[PDB]
């Protein structure tokens, strides 16, 4: 890979990222599916933390 | 080995066969014995045979020996708690010192088998890696799976240049 102190390309300069298109149905649907997803997952995570506490402090 | 007058004790086998293992409290061990007498006899025998086995099995434990200081032979033990154990060895047979030391600070054969079991479960059959740590490696090997392309060149389709020559054209 590159490094901090390396010079940037001549072809990378005049180019800033052009975003991908958005679709409303799919998008909102996704914000929800994901919202709920990391919801149940951040739940199972705290569950696993309770597990770790249990194993260790019962050790 | 020829030289030495009981070379069988410089064997690797004789070092792993002799059994006493020391607790985690025992750190220093002093052996104080006498040169001249028929009353120090088995002790010198204990030095000349068993100290080898002890020491091998107990590397981090310092063992020392003092000759002809005190008129009668003994063992001294210095533990982590500052507990100083004293084992009087006089007319004792070699084996009696062995098994009495085994008695005082041993480790239950149970404890040993449990510990070694803890270390054997550390080696897992299911994993995959270099031949050093595990058995199987890339699963070129395992039965139902795909034979890896070194041994058995795969069908023409599954090749990358086939998929690219088909995608381009």
């Amino acid at each position: 890979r590159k490094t901090r102190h390396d010079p940037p390309a001549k072809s990378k300069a005049g180019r800033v990222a052009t975003p991908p298109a958005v679709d409303p149905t799919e998008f909102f649907v996704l914000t929800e599916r994901y919202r709920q997803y990391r919801q149940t997952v951040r739940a199972l995570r705290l569950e696993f933390m309770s597990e770790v506490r249990k194993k260790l402090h019962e050790a | 080995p020829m030289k030495g007058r009981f070379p069988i004790r410089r064997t690797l086998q004789y070092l792993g066969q002799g059994d006493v293992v020391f607790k985690d409290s025992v750190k220093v061990m002093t052996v104080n014995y006498n040169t001249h007498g028929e009353l120090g006899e088995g002790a010198r025998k204990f030095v000349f045979f068993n100290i080898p086995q002890i020491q091998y099995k107990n590397p981090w434990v310092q063992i020392t020996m003092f000759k002809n200081m005190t008129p009668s032979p003994f063992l001294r033990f210095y533990l982590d708690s500052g507990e100083q154990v004293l084992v009087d060895v006089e007319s004792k047979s070699n084996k009696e010192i062995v098994e009495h030391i085994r008695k005082i600070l041993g480790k239950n054969e149970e404890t040993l088998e449990k510990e070694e079991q803890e270390k054997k479960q550390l080696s897992h059959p299911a994993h995959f890696g270099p031949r050093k740590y595990c058995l199987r490696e890339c699963m070129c090997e395992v039965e139902g799976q795909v034979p890896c392309p070194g041994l058995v060149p795969l069908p023409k389709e599954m090749t990358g240049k086939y998929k690219a020559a088909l995608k381009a054209t």
Partner: protein, 109 residues
């Protein structure tokens, strides 16, 4: 309960080599190390510095060294715990009577 010394040294038996510094004993420690070629154990020695409060150690003594929780100097990791054998004066731990070599100076009766 935290008081520790990171040194493997936690307890040692060692001879007293020298008195040459103030309140500090120079102690010879002797371990059995295995030579892998011959399969044979020899005495490898290490010179340890110890702190004595009494300045009590004559040269040639047998001394029990206790680890010090916090190092004093670079070279002082230890404390004289107890004197196991005094040089020229030894009391039998077994019978508690004074001795020189194999000779009881004070016998029973």
């Amino acid at each position: 309960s935290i008081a520790r010394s990171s040194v493997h040294a936690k307890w040692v038996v060692g001879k007293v080599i020298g008195t040459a510094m103030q309140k500090t004993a120079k102690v010879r420690v002797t371990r059995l190390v295995l030579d892998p070629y011959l399969l044979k154990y020899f005495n490898k020695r290490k010179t340890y510095f110890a702190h004595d409060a009494l300045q009590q150690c004559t040269v040639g003594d047998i001394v029990l060294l206790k680890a010090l929780p916090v190092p004093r100097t670079k070279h002082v990791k230890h404390e004289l715990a107890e004197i196991i054998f005094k040089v020229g004066q030894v009391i039998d731990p077994v019978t508690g009577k004074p001795c020189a070599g194999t000779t009881y100076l004070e016998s029973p009766i």
